[PDB]
Design a protein around this nucleic acid. Structure first.
Length: 1313
DNA sequence: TAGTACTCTGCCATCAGAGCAAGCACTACGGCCGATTG
DNA sequence: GATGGCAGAGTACTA
RNA sequence: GGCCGUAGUGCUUGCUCUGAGUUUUAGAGCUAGAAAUAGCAAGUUAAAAUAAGGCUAGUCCGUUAUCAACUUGAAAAAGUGGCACCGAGUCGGUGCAGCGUGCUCAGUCUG
DNA sequence: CAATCAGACTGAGCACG
C-alpha cells in the first residue's frame, strides 16, 4: 500500500497516463507474461499512452442511407408506370419491358433481341434518325396531334418521371410567362390604373437587365428602386417588386393594416395569406398581385428556358433542341476551321481520348470546364473564331443536354410537358384518358419530410403510424398514413425531457402556464418603494393578482411607470389569443385551461395549415369559422425547459400547494422558483430527488454516447475511463488520492469560396472579378483576410495591394496576451499594427470612429461576424476594463468546458462511491482538472521542452507533468480546490499572474526559499534541489508503454469507382450474375481482419498437398460469410485440412516481435507498419528545440542571447542526432536506400546555418517513427516511402496481445504451430 | 529455357446542391437567482 | 489528406 | 451553476428530395486495302445498376458507435497476473515472501 | 437588523505455535 496519483492527458487520437508516488517518482513493477514462450515476467514502468484512430460522425452513413432510399423509391415509381401500361404494352409489343430490363447485358446473355425499343435494326435506326435525343421525341409528342406509338409515349413519360426536378418552388408555374419587360409594363399599367392619384412612370428603364441581373436579389431590388422615381423601398411598388423577385415584404405600412400580413410567393401558404390580405383591404388589388405573380414566374423562368414559348408547349424541350443544333453547327464550323488552319492538331483534338479536347469531351470523362480550358487557346490562335470565343466566354460552346447546371429546372416544367402529352393522346388511348390523374400523382408525389420512412416495425429510424394495414402507394397515401400522429411523433421524438422529472416531456415555450410562471417569477422579485414605507416591502398575493389582471391581462408590455400609475396611483400569448378569439371570460376561465394548452400545443407542433385545421376540428364547435381561420393563421415556435407536472402537478406534502400556487401566494416572502426548489423544509426538493433516482444510470458506453460533443472526444473519454480502471486494478485495487486530467482544445476551402462569393455579391463589389482566386489559394490566411476585408485596410481608410501581400501584419482585435484566439473571427489584416493605437487594449476610439461605417457595411455583407463587430467597436462601449482583463487572465488557467466537466464527473462517480451516516459522499478520490497552459508554461520555464516529431512519448510525459503540477498546486494552495478540484480587480489580477511562481527560485528580484512549504501546515510541496532532478530523470526514461489500439475495419466494402472490363481477378462483380470480365466492377476491397491459417494447398499438375502457413485477408463483404462457416470458407478458397484451433484472428495494428527488438504492426494481410519508438536523449531534444526556434522566440533579450550561444557551442549535437537516427534505422527500420539518400543529403547540406539544419533534421524523424511509412523532405531532396509489402516474415515471430495499458501481455510464438 | 514468384515504383481514390425539425456549446450583454445563530 | 491496393516493369530460383 | 430577454456563430442527430458522374448494351460506319494500315465520316441520347445482398417481405434494412489474450456463461457480463531496493537504450539485476495469539508501555483520534 | 474511564490505529519489551 502506497499513496499514489494518476495523471491523464486526453487527445482525439491519444490518451496518456501516468502513476506517481508522493515524491513525484513513477513506480516500476514486474508483470507476469502469459503464453507459450519461455518469458514469464517482464519489468515495466507505470507510464505510457494509448493511441487510436479518430472516431467519425454518422453524417456519411446518413447520406448513404438517404441515397439508398431515394434509389429504391425511384425504381418504385418506374414500376408503377409500367404497371399502368402493362395491358396495352402487352397488346402492342409484349416483350418491350423485358427488353428494357435487360439492356445492361452482353448479346449472349439477352434472351431477346439486342435492340430495346422496336426489336429490329431497321426500326431502331429509323427511330434514332428521326429523334436524335429524347427531347426531340418529347417536343414531337407535345406538339403533334396525330396518333403516336405506345412505346414512344411510355418512353417520354418514363424519362419525365425518372428525372423530375427540384421541388423548391411550390404552387403552380405557367411557362407562357417568359417576357420580363412585357410583364413589367403590364404590372406598371395595373399600378397606374389602380393608384390613379400617384401614378408611377418606369419608361426608359432596363427592367429586364435590372431584374435578371446576376447580383443578389436585394441588390437587384435596390438597383431597381434607385432607377425608379416616385417610390422607394418599403413603399407599395417597392414591396410589389420585392415580392415578385422573391423577397418577403411586409404590406402593413402600405395600407396601415397594423398586422404583418407578410406574403412569400414561393411558399405554399401564399394563397391563404393573399386571401387574408384581400379580405383585409379590398378586392381591387387582386389584379396587381396576379401581375406580380406572373412577373415572378417570368423572372425565374427566363433564366432557365431561354427560348420563345409562344409557338410550342414544351419550352424546355425546345431549349434542349436548340442547344443540340448549336452544338452541331459549332462542331461543323470548328472542324472546318481546324482543317483549314491547323491540320496537324486535328488528330489530337477529335480522336485522342486521353488528352482533353472534343474526343476527351465526348468519349472520355473530361468535363465542360476542362474542355474549355483545353480549347480556348486553340480558338484564340485562329481566325474566324470570334463568335465561338464569345460562346466560350459565356460558357455556351458545344454543350451537352444532360449537364450539371440542369439542377435548376423545377419539376413543374416536366409536369406541364407530361400533362400536355396526356391531353394530346387521350382520345386514341382510353386507358391514357383514365389514368391521367394517377400518372401525374406519380410524377409529383414525395413523402413529407415529417412522415419519414414507411416501415412496418422493423426500422430504428421510422416513426410513421398507419391507420390501415395495407400497401402504401402514392394514391392512397392520405387514406392509409395517419399524417397528424406521424407529425406529432416526428416532433416529440426529438424534444427534450425535463431534467427535474426525467420521465416528463417539456412544455411548449409559448404555453400559457409557462407565460404565467415567467411573469410571476419576474413580478415576485420587484420590490416597490414609495412614501410612507419604513423599509422596502414585497408584493402580496392579492396585490400581484390585481397587478396581473390590470396590467398583464390588458397590455402586452408592462413597465414600472405603468405599474405605478394604473395601480399604485389609480388604486393605491394571452393577448395574441385575446385578439383572435375575442373572448375574455373564456380566456380567463379555469375549466378550459386544458383546451388552451391543447391549442398552443397544436400550433407549436404543426407547421402545415391543413394539419392544424384538421387537428383543431375538435374545437370547431366552440368558436366560429372566422375564429378557426385566425387560429390556423397564428403559429408559435419554441419549446420550454420545464415540464407541466413540475410546474403545476406536484404539490407540497405539508401544504398541498404547487409551485405556481406558492408563487401566486408568496406574500411578504416572495420566494422564487430556485428558492422553492432548494428549500430544505419544503418537500419539492425531496420529490424532485425521488424522481431523478428512478432510472439511475445506463452503462458507461451508453452514458458517453449520450454526452454531447465530438465522437472523437467521446472515444478518447471512454479509453481514458478504461485505462484508469486498469491502473486501479494494477495498483492492488487501491483508489488514488487524486486524478489530474486535461483535455486538448481540438471542404473548408469550398466554404471559404462560397462565403467570399456571397459577400462580394451582397456588397456589389468586383474584387473577385478583378483577379479571381482559387480555393487552394484562398486557403492562405493573409489572402483570405485581404479578400474578406474587400481589399482595404481595416484600421485606417486606405487600399491594400494583393501583389504587396506577405509584407503587412496580421493584428488581432483582442491582444493575444489577454486571449489566445488565432481564428479569423479575431484576426485582422492591416498595413501597420501601430494604427490600432495602444498594443494592450481594444482598437483606439479614433480608429473605431473612422472605420465604424466600413465595419457596419462589412457586417451587413456577412464578411465579418456579429462577435467580431462587437469586439472591434468595444472602444465606444468603454474598451477593455480592468475587471475584463482580470477575467481574461484568470480564464487562461481555469478549465470551464462542459466536456471536461462531464469527464471529471464520470471519473468522480466511478471512484468515490461510499456514503456517510448523513448521506454525505466521501471524497476519497479528488479529481483535478487543469488547462494545457500551466504545463506548457512549466515546460518553457524549466527547460523541459517538448518536440512532437521525435516520438509518441510526449503524451505520457504530458500526463506525468499534469499529475505533478496538479498535485503540487493543490498541496500548496488548498484554498484553490474550489476552482480545480471537482466537487479586488488588482488583487485578482496579480494573484493569477504569480500562481505558478512558487516553482521558480527567483521572481522578476525575489530570492524565494529553497524548500517550499504549504504554510500553516508542515507539508513540503516542492524542493528545487532534488524534485527537478526527479522530473528530469522521469522524462529521460527509455521505457514507456505505447499501445496502438487494434481495431477491426468496418465501412464501405471497397472503392466506389466502377472500373471498365478487364481480365483481372481483382475485379468484384457488381451483381451476382454480372461477370466482371464482361461487365466491369469494383476493386480494392477493405480487409476487415487477417486470419492465420495453417493448411495444405494443391501445387503443380499433381496437385500435391504442401503444408502452408499464410495470412488471409477477410474483406468486409465476406466477413459474415466467413464467420458463419470458417471451414467451408477456407476450403472454397483452395486450402485443405485447415485447423480450426490453429486459426488465429489478427485485427489491424497487431504487434509482432521479430529480432533485436524489431517490431512490426499489421497494416493488412499484405502490408506492415513500423512499431518502434526512438528514445532520443533529452539533451538532444532540448538542443533541437532551441536551435529550431519552436514558436519563434518568446524570451527576454538577455535570456534569448545566452540560448543562442548555447546552440553555437553545441553545434556538434547535429552529427550525434544523425548518428542516433542512422543506427536506429540500421537496427530496426532497415530502409537502406532511404538511409543512404538521407546521409548524402546531410553531407551535401552541411554548411547551412544551424537553424535551417535543425529545422530540416526535425523532418528526418519521419523515417524513424511509429505507424505507416510516409514521405518526407530534407531540404530540396525528397525521400519517398519504403513500404513493407510482405507479411511472410511475421509468421515466425512473436505475436503480442497487449491490454489497454500494455502492462498485461500474452506472447504467442507462431513459429511452433 | 519457361514459368512462377517476390520486389520496387508510381497512380489513385464519387461529387455538388435544397429544404425541415430538435438539441447543445459558446459569445455578448443585462436583470433576477449561497446557509446557520440572536 | 493519407495510406493501402493495384498494375506494370524488373530480377531470381527451380522444373 | 439556472432562467429569462435580445442578437449571433458553430456543431450534432434524423427525415424528404435534386442534378450530375461511372459501368454494359442499343444508336448498321464508309472506302482503298490480302492483312496490319491509311484516308474520310460520326460524336450531344436512352435503358439498367449505383455498395454484394437480407428476411422480417416493408415503397423495409445494409458504411455510426462497440471490439487485447484466457476461463466461465446462450447471451448480456463476471473473473485471471506478489513486494521492496539498486540501476537504465525500450527494461535489467539483487533481496524477501510465496508470521498468528495474550500481557505491559508510549503516542494519535472518537464518546 | 447583528455574527460565521471506554473503543480504534502505530511503534517498543515478554510468553506460546
Amino acid at each position: 500500500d502506497k499513496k499514489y496519483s494518476i495523471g491523464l492527458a486526453i487527445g482525439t487520437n491519444s490518451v496518456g497516463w501516468a502513476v506517481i508516488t508522493d515524491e513525484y517518482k513513477v513506480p516500476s513493477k514486474k508483470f507476469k507474461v502469459l503464453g507459450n514462450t519461455d518469458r514469464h515476467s517482464i519489468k515495466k514502468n507505470l507510464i505510457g499512452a494509448l493511441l487510436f484512430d479518430s472516431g467519425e460522425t454518422a453524417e456519411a452513413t446518413r447520406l448513404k442511407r438517404t441515397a439508398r432510399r431515394r434509389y429504391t423509391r425511384r425504381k418504385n415509381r418506374i414500376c408503377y408506370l409500367q404497371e399502368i401500361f402493362s395491358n396495352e404494352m402487352a397488346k402492342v409489343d409484349d416483350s418491350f419491358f423485358h427488353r428494357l430490363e435487360e439492356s445492361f447485358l452482353v448479346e449472349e446473355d439477352k434472351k431477346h433481341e439486342r435492340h430495346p425499343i422496336f426489336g429490329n435494326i431497321v426500326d431502331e435506326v429509323a427511330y434514332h434518325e428521326k429523334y436524335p435525343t429524347i427531347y426531340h421525341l418529347r417536343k414531337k409528342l407535345v406538339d403533334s396531334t396525330d396518333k403516336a406509338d405506345l412505346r414512344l409515349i411510355y418512353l417520354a413519360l418514363a424519362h419525365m418521371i425518372k428525372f423530375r426536378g427540384h421541388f423548391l418552388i411550390e404552387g403552380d408555374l405557367n411557362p407562357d410567362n417568359s417576357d420580363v419587360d412585357k410583364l413589367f409594363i403590364q404590372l406598371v399599367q395595373t399600378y397606374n390604373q389602380l393608384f390613379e392619384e400617384n401614378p408611377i412612370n418606369a419608361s426608359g428603364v432596363d427592367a429586364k437587365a435590372i431584374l435578371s441581373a446576376r447580383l443578389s436579389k436585394s441588390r437587384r431590388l435596390e438597383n431597381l428602386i434607385a432607377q425608379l422615381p416616385g417610390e422607394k423601398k418599403n413603399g407599395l411598388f417597392g414591396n410589389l417588386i420585392a415580392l415578385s423577385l422573391g423577397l418577403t415584404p411586409n404590406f402593413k405600412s402600405n395600407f396601415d393594416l397594423a398586422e404583418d400580413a407578410k406574403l412569400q410567393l414561393s411558399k405554399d401558404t401564399y394563397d391563404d395569406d393573399l386571401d387574408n390580405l384581400l379580405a383585409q383591404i379590398g378586392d381591387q388589388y387582386a389584379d396587381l398581385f396576379l401581375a406580380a405573380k406572373n412577373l415572378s414566374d417570368a423572372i425565374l423562368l427566363s433564366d432557365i428556358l431561354r427560348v420563345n414559348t409562344e409557338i410550342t408547349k414544351a419550352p424546355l424541350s425546345a431549349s434542349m433542341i436548340k442547344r443540340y443544333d448549336e452544338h452541331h453547327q459549332d462542331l461543323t464550323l470548328l472542324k472546318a476551321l481546324v482543317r483549314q488552319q491547323l491540320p496537324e492538331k486535328y488528330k489530337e483534338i477529335f480522336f485522342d481520348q486521353s488528352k482533353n479536347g472534343y474526343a476527351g469531351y465526348i468519349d472520355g470523362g473530361a468535363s465542360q470546364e476542362e474542355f474549355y480550358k483545353f480549347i480556348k487557346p486553340i480558338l484564340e490562335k485562329m481566325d474566324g473564331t470570334e463568335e465561338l470565343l464569345v460562346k466560350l466566354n459565356r460558357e455556351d460552346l458545344l454543350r451537352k443536354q444532360r449537364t450539371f447546371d440542369n439542377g435548376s429546372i423545377p419539376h413543374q416544367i416536366h409536369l406541364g410537358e407530361l400533362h400536355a402529352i396526356l391531353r394530346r393522346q387521350e382520345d386514341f388511348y382510353p386507358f391514357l384518358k383514365d389514368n391521367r390523374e394517377k400518372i401525374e400523382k406519380i410524377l409529383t408525389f414525395r413523402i413529407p419530410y415529417y412522415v419519414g420512412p414507411l416501415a412496418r416495425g422493423n426500422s430504428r429510424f421510422a416513426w410513421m403510424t398507419r391507420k390501415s394495414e395495407e400497401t402504401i402507394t402514392p394514391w392512397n397515401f392520405e387514406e392509409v398514413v395517419d399524417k397528424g400522429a406521424s407529425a406529432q411523433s416526428f416532433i416529440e421524438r426529438m424534444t427534450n425531457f425535463d431534467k427535474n422529472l426525467p420521465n416528463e416531456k417539456v412544455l411548449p415555450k409559448h404555453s400559457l402556464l409557462y407565460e404565467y410562471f415567467t411573469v410571476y417569477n419576474e413580478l415576485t422579485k420587484v420590490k416597490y418603494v414609495t412614501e410612507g414605507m419604513r423599509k422596502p416591502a414585497f408584493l402580496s398575493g392579492e396585490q400581484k393578482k390585481a397587478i396581473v389582471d390590470l396590467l398583464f391581462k390588458t397590455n402586452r408590455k408592462v413597465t414600472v411607470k405603468q405599474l405605478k400609475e394604473d395601480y399604485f396611483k389609480k388604486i393605491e400569448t394571452y393577448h395574441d389569443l385575446l385578439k383572435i378569439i375575442k373572448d375574455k371570460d373564456f380566456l380567463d376561465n379555469e375549466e378550459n385551461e386544458d383546451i388552451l394548452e391543447d391549442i398552443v400545443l397544436t400550433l407549436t407542433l404543426f407547421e402545415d395549415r391543413e394539419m392544424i385545421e384538421e387537428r383543431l376540428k375538435t374545437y370547431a364547435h366552440l368558436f366560429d369559422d372566422k375564429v378557426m381561420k385566425q387560429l390556423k393563421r397564428r403559429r408559435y415556435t419554441g419549446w420550454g425547459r420545464l415540464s407541466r407536472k413540475l410546474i403545476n402537478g406536484i404539490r407540497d406534502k405539508q401544504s398541498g400547494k404547487t409551485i405556481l400556487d406558492f408563487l401566486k401566494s408568496d406574500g411578504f416572502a416572495n420566494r422564487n422558483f430556485m428558492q422553492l426548489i432548494h428549500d430544505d423544509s419544503l418537500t419539492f426538493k425531496e420529490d424532485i430527488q425521488k424522481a431523478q433516482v428512478s432510472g439511475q444510470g445506463d452503462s458507461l458506453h451508453e452514458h458517453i454516447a449520450n454526452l454531447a460533443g465530438s465522437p472523437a472526444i467521446k472515444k478518447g473519454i471512454l479509453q481514458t475511463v478504461k485505462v484508469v480502471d486498469e491502473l486501479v486494478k494494477v495498483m492492488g485495487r487501491h483508489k488514488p488520492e487524486n486524478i489530474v486530467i486535461e483535455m486538448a482544445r481540438e471542404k473548408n476551402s469550398r466554404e471559404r469560396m462560397k462565403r467570399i462569393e456571397e459577400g462580394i455579391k451582397e456588397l456589389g463589389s468586383q474584387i473577385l472579378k478583378e483577379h479571381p482566386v482559387e480555393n487552394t489559394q484562398l486557403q492562405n490566411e493573409k489572402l483570405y483576410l485581404y479578400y474578406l476585408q474587400n481589399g482595404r485596410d481595416m484600421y485606417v481608410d486606405q487600399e491594400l495591394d494583393i501583389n504587396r501581400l506577405s509584407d503587412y501584419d496580421v493584428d488581432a482585435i483582442v491582444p493575444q496576451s489577454f486571449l489566445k484566439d488565432d481564428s479569423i473571427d479575431n484576426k485582422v489584416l492591416t498595413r501597420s499594427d501601430k494604427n490600432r493605437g495602444k498594443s494592450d487594449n481594444v482598437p483606439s476610439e479614433e480608429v473605431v470612429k473612422k472605420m465604424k461605417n466600413y465595419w457596419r457595411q462589412l457586417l451587413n455583407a456577412k464578411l465579418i461576424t456579429q462577435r467580431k463587430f462587437d469586439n472591434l467597436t468595444k472602444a465606444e462601449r468603454g474598451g477593455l476594463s480592468e475587471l475584463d482583463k482580470a477575467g481574461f487572465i484568470k480564464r487562461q488557467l481555469v478549465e470551464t468546458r462542459q466536456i471536461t466537466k462531464h469527464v471529471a464527473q464520470i471519473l468522480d462517480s466511478r471512484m468515490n462511491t461510499k456514503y456517510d451516516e448523513n448521506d454525505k459522499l466521501i471524497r476519497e478520490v479528488k479529481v483535478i482538472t487543469l488547462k494545457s497552459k500551466l504545463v506548457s508554461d512549466f515546460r518553457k520555464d524549466f527547460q523541459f521542452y517538448k518536440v512532437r516529431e521525435i516520438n509518441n512519448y510526449h503524451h505520457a510525459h504530458d500526463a506525468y507533468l499534469n499529475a505533478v503540477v496538479g498535485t503540487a498546486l493543490i498541496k500548496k494552495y488548498p484554498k484553490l480546490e474550489s476552482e480545480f478540484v471537482y466537487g479586488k480587480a488588482t488583487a485578482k489580477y496579480f494573484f493569477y499572474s504569480n500562481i505558478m511562481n512558487f516553482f521558480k527560485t527567483e521572481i522578476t528580484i525575489r530570492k524565494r526559499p529553497l524548500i517550499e512549504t504549504n504554510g500553516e501546515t508542515g507539508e513540503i510541496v516542492w524542493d528545487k534541489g532534488r524534485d527537478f532532478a526527479t522530473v528530469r530523470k522521469v522524462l529521460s526514461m527509455p521505457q514507456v508503454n505505447i499501445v496502438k489500439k487494434t481495431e477491426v475495419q468496418t465501412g464501405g466494402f471497397s472503392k466506389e469507382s466502377i472500373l471498365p472490363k478487364r481480365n483481372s481477378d481483382k475485379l468484384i462483380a457488381r451483381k451476382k450474375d454480372w461477370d466482371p470480365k464482361k461487365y466491369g466492377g469494383f476493386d480494392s476491397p477493405t480487409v476487415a481482419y487477417s486470419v492465420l491459417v495453417v493448411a495444405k494447398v494443391e501445387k503443380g499438375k499433381s496437385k500435391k498437398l504442401k503444408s502452408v502457413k499464410e495470412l488471409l485477408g477477410i474483406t468486409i463483404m465476406e466477413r459474415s460469410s466467413f464467420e458463419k462457416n470458417p471451414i467451408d470458407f477456407l476450403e472454397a478458397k483452395g486450402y485443405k485440412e485447415v485447423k480450426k484451433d490453429l486459426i488465429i484472428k489478427l485485427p489491424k495494428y497487431s504487434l509482432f516481435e521479430l529480432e533485436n527488438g524489431r517490431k512490426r504492426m499489421l497494416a493488412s494481410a499484405g502490408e506492415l507498419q513500423k512499431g518502434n519508438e526512438l528514445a532520443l536523449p533529452s539533451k538532444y531534444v532540448n538542443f533541437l528545440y532551441l536551435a529550431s526556434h519552436y514558436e519563434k522566440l518568446k524570451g527576454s533579450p538577455e535570456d534569448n542571447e545566452q540560448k543562442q550561444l548555447f546552440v553555437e557551442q553545441h553545434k556538434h549535437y547535429l552529427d550525434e542526432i544523425i548518428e542516433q537516427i542512422s543506427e536506429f534505422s540500421k537496427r530496426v527500420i532497415l530502409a537502406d536506400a532511404n538511409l543512404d539518400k538521407v546521409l548524402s543529403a546531410y553531407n551535401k547540406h552541411r554548411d547551412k546555418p544551424i537553424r535551417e539544419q535543425a529545422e530540416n533534421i526535425i523532418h528526418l524523424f519521419t523515417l524513424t517513427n511509429l505507424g505507416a511509412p510516409a514521405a518526407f523532405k530534407y531540404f530540396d531532396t525528397t525521400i519517398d516511402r519504403k513500404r513493407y509489402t510482405s507479411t511472410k516474415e511475421v509468421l515466425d515471430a512473436t505475436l503480442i496481445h497487449q491490454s489497454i495499458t500494455g502492462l498485461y501481455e500474452t506472447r504467442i510464438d507462431l513459429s511452433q504451430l
